């Protein structure tokens, strides 16, 4: 076996490296230190970390968001500390339970939710700048910042664009562990079963596909670690036996193959499309489709099955039936 693919047998220690950026080099705060156990399966140097304006901005907004959530959550167990710790998962900060339309909700009915939602948004904006800037400072392309943009856009879609599009804040996502989960079921039920939404299908396709692709890619690189396949940048600008062998494994298996660069493009693209397909699905929901199952039925896509127990008429439609 190649044990290096499992863990690093002999760890190297050497003086730490700093790659100078176009700016902010004075903001790299901290001393590197080295975890020996971490070093077995990763780089052992933890730290330093860059601060910077957008990063600090991000932490400011983000923490404000968190204070509003945790304060409303504390209110929910009436500021009992032990009940707070016990019930934490169940606790949440909710959107309007009443239909105020696009009216700014009272603080007690979704007002705080909208606030925390706004600060979280600013938090994500600031962080995006940080993620985009650092690439530019270091002379890198902005591929990551664009993959991140798609992800933020999704969040905005379920957070406020869809609520806006249909004209109700009542539809946004609660903050809380079980509450943001319950929303998933409330929203699918309201919109006629999200399994029958094509873009839900697309998104899962790409998500499963990211699993397929990162399993196959990560495995492919460990399998040619002996030939220095991990050094992917110089395998791009100067093809070596690593990625000749990686390509041929795949060609001989599935009939076509990528290159060591293009496979990262496939990966990036699959990643991106999880969030892009998801957004499109949400922009269409409520706006133009009300019941995704019926929409499939309308277009002929839906499966249908025999009765097993007897077919059951709607009692409400029986004549003489109450209300």
């Amino acid at each position: 076996a190649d044990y290096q693919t499992i863990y690093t047998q002999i760890q190297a220690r050497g003086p730490h490296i700093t790659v100078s950026g176009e700016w902010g080099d004075n903001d790299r705060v901290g001393k590197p230190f080295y975890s020996y156990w971490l070093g077995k399966i990763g780089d052992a140097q933890i730290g330093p970390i860059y601060l910077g304006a957008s990063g600090i901005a991000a932490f400011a907004f983000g923490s404000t968001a968190i204070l509003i959530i945790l304060f409303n959550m504390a209110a929910e167990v009436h500021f009992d500390p032990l009940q707070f710790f016990r019930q934490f998962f169940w606790l949440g900060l909710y959107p309007p339970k009443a239909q105020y339309g696009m009216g700014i909700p009272p603080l007690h009915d979704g007002g705080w939710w909208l606030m925390a939602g706004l600060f979280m948004t600013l938090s994500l904006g600031s962080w995006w700048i940080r993620v985009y800037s650092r690439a530019r400072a270091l002379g890198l392309g902005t591929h990551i910042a664009w993959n991140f943009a798609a992800a933020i856009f999704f969040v905005l879609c379920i957070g406020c664009i869809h609520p806006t599009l249909v004209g109700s804040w009542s539809e946004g996502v609660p903050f809380g562990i079980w509450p943001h989960i319950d929303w998933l079921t409330a929203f699918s039920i309201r919109y006629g079963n999200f399994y029958y939404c094509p873009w839900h299908g697309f998104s899962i396709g790409f998500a499963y596909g990211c699993g397929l692709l990162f399993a196959a890619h990560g495995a492919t690189i460990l399998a040619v670690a002996r030939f220095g396949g991990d050094r992917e940048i110089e395998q791009i600008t100067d093809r070596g036996t690593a990625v000749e062998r990686a390509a041929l494994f795949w060609r001989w298996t599935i009939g076509f193959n990528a290159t060591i660069e293009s496979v990262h493009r496939w990966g990036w693209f699959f990643s991106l499309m999880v969030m892009v397909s998801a957004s499109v699905g949400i922009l269409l929901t409520g706006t133009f489709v009300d019941n995704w199952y019926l929409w499939c039925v309308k277009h002929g896509a839906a499966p249908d099955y025999p009765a097993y127990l007897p077919a059951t008429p709607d009692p409400a439609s029986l004549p003489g039936a109450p209300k």
Partner: peptide, 20 residues
């Protein structure tokens, strides 16, 4: 849950609609 595939105009926007 709605009983039409598309949103009926007149119950599908703003205060016309039931809250989630």
């Amino acid at each position: 849950v709605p009983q039409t595939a598309l949103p009926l105009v007149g119950v599908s926007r703003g205060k016309e609609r039931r809250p989630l």
